[PDB]
Structure 1
Amino acid sequence: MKKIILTIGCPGSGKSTWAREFIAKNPGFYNINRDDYRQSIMAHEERDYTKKKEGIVTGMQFDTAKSILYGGDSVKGVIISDTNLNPERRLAWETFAKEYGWKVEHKVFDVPWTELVKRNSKRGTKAVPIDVLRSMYKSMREYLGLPVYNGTPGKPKAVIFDVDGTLAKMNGRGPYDLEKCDTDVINPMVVELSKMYALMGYQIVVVSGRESGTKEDPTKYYRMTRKWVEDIAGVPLVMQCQREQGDTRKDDVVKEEIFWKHIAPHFDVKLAIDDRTQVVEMWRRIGVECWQVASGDF
């Protein structure tokens, strides 16, 4: 059968680039894009929203697929290089292909949020607002079937606190120089908050993206951080999780893995306090309310 290839991915994920390259290497494939169409019927009005226009672009897409997909044995298929993140539209393509006898394949472009943001900020006039991008990424996560937290019944309620930038600031050292992280001063209001919650009966769970330690001393930083939280901040934590030694992945990935493995099953986490934008974005995205206490664009 002729293929109908739907690209699935948030804007800037590489869908168009792939489409061009693929067509350049496999004769018999054509591209259909709601976007070449959207810009076209408007004579290229800057992207800076009608149900009718969208109805036109939709008609263009299917009518164009039918015509192309009926060429001779020369035509192999069509690529629908849109985000295709709306489930109903994806279904519409499959039921369309079933009645005309064509097969539907998916070409996924799962790019990390941090890469999506980075690329999007350079997209120029094709850049998309952060809120629609975050919305696209949420749909992408639902497509991949990634987990969303909804509480842990029968478990004590808890608040998650990060260390760097949240409970602590930094008294003249420098990001990634943990050897002197014992000099960090307290962020008064946040430190105070953690004590307030404890009094309210919440379990205080501390998390940190600081590497636990070095190759020869795997918990060097985990220990200093623990002493700092105990002796300097005075935070009555029930648990302290931290990036494992050697682990070079993004705080992003590291903290979520830590969450599902070590926190979610033991606590009914009601809140997370953090400062790094990519982490704060991770928390809210997986279902955990998150309060950002300072600028964290790094």
Structure 2
Amino acid sequence: MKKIILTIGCPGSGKSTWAREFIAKNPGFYNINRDDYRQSIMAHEERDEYKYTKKKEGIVTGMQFDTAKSILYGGDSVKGVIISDTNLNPERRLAWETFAKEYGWKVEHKVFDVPWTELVKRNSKRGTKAVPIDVLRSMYKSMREYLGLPVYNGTPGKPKAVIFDVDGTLAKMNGGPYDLEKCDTDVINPMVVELSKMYALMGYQIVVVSGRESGTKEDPTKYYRMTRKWVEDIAGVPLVMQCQREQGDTRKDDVVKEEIFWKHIAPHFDVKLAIDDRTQVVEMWRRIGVECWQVASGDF
């Protein structure tokens, strides 16, 4: 009858803020947190001062389960417990399902799916509770595994290709990209454009992608043609295909380019590489299996 709620989410996804507000509005619920015990057994003031050990982490796991057994063995006043950890490791989630089955408690899951760009923005302002960017990346990968989101592993039988972006990659940025009035030979990124020709003259199919809205309501392909006439004629990129943001799509550069990949690029080509600039997009190709070469500082 009693519940064991596990919060699933990367650091900064809102787990602690919810757990506090849930216990206030629903009496009988208690919190069990790893970070709280880690900081308590060492008497630390700042959460970043902590250094992991198999011995320390073993004591913390012990404190979690012993406290869970003790609280849930109380009267009918005790409705359940919340484990406000990241719970991104499959072995830890299984350990809580093995534990509930042995004593007759219900395991519930509270998922906190927050976008990557927002998680990084929150982690930079987190202060002493901030995690290194490589561990936040490692955790968003575990979040995608839990959510069941796709990872690319190739497309056998189709031609080999390289994806090129226009936004700050083939086109040198000024200042927030460059104007469509300034589209001449002085806005070309020499080394990157030389790379597209070098790959095209080696059996690779050059697929060009862009985040720029394709057109207006009255003319849906206005900017698409003004971008293709630059990439093909003024830049000299030997492209086989150019798909960009559909007219009227207000979504983030992050999700638009992933959708363009799975719908138009992935089923027709065997993508071996992606040349991009913007950090959030570079992070996206890398986590879904496509290899990236970030050509410039693209922070956003």
Fold agreement, TM-score > 0.5: yes
Q: In 1, are the aligned partners of 2:151 and 2:289 still within 8 Å (CA)?
A: yes
Find 1:224's aligned residue among 223, 226, 231: 226
User: How many Å apart are 1:57 and its aligned residue?
Assistant: 0.4
Q: Tell me, what secondary structure is at the counterpart of 1:258? A: helix
Which whole-Å CA distance do the structure 2 matches of 1:5 and 1:251 have between them? 34
Q: In 1, are the aligned partners of 2:35 and 2:47 still within 8 Å (CA)?
A: no
Which whole-Å CA distance do the structure 2 matches of 1:13 and 1:171 have between them? 34
Q: Relative to structure 1, is the Cα distance of residues 21 and 195 closer, same or farther in structure 2, using a 3 angstrom cutoff?
A: same
Which whole-Å CA distance do the structure 2 matches of 1:79 and 1:183 have between them? 60
Q: Relative to structure 1, is the Cα distance of residues 47 and 181 closer, same or farther in structure 2, using a 3 angstrom cutoff?
A: farther
Write out per-residue CA displacement over residues 128-187 of structure 1, whole angstroms, 9 at most, x where no aligned residue.
Answer: 100000001000000000000000000000000000100111467x53854655676110
Q: In 1, are the aligned partners of 2:6 and 2:110 still within 8 Å (CA)?
A: yes
Q: In 2, are the aligned partners of 1:9 and 1:84 still within 8 Å (CA)?
A: yes
User: How many Å apart are 1:47 and its aligned residue?
Assistant: 3.8
Q: Tell me, what secondary structure is at the counterpart of 1:181? A: coil
Q: In 1, are the aligned partners of 2:167 and 2:177 still within 8 Å (CA)?
A: no
Which whole-Å CA distance do the structure 1 matches of 2:32 and 2:179 have between them? 50
Which whole-Å CA distance do the structure 1 matches of 2:79 and 2:184 have between them? 63
Which whole-Å CA distance do the structure 1 matches of 2:13 and 2:261 have between them? 27
Q: In 2, are the aligned partners of 1:179 and 1:221 still within 8 Å (CA)?
A: no
Aligned residue pair count: 297
Q: In 1, are the aligned partners of 2:168 and 2:177 still within 8 Å (CA)?
A: no
Alignment of 1:250-261 (within 5 A): 250-261=252-263
Q: In 2, are the aligned partners of 1:168 and 1:184 still within 8 Å (CA)?
A: no
| Corresponding position of 1:6 | 6
Which whole-Å CA distance do the structure 1 matches of 2:77 and 2:101 have between them? 21
Write out per-residue CA displacement over residues 188-243 of structure 1, whole angstroms, 9 at most, x where no aligned residue.
Answer: 00000001101110000000011111122211111111000011111011110100
| Corresponding position of 1:145 | 148
Which whole-Å CA distance do the structure 2 matches of 1:266 and 1:231 have between them? 25
Q: In 2, are the aligned partners of 1:182 and 1:224 still within 8 Å (CA)?
A: no
Q: In 2, are the aligned partners of 1:170 and 1:184 still within 8 Å (CA)?
A: no
Gaps of 5+ in 2: none
Q: In 1, are the aligned partners of 2:206 and 2:239 still within 8 Å (CA)?
A: yes
Q: TM-score, normalised by structure 2?
A: 0.96
Q: Tell me, what secondary structure is at the counterpart of 2:154? A: coil
CA-atom RMSD, angstroms? 1.4
Q: In 1, are the aligned partners of 2:205 and 2:239 still within 8 Å (CA)?
A: yes
1:170 aligns with 2:170: no
Gaps of 5+ in 1: none
Q: Relative to structure 1, is the Cα distance of residues 34 and 230 closer, same or farther in structure 2, using a 3 angstrom cutoff?
A: same
Q: In 2, are the aligned partners of 1:181 and 1:224 still within 8 Å (CA)?
A: no
Q: Relative to structure 1, is the Cα distance of residues 179 and 111 closer, same or farther in structure 2, using a 3 angstrom cutoff?
A: farther
User: How many Å apart are 1:254 and its aligned residue?
Assistant: 0.1
Q: Relative to structure 1, is the Cα distance of residues 22 and 233 closer, same or farther in structure 2, using a 3 angstrom cutoff?
A: same
Compare 279-288 and 208-217 and name the one that shifted more. Answer: 208-217
Q: Relative to structure 1, is the Cα distance of residues 228 and 37 closer, same or farther in structure 2, using a 3 angstrom cutoff?
A: same
Which whole-Å CA distance do the structure 2 matches of 1:252 and 1:40 have between them? 39
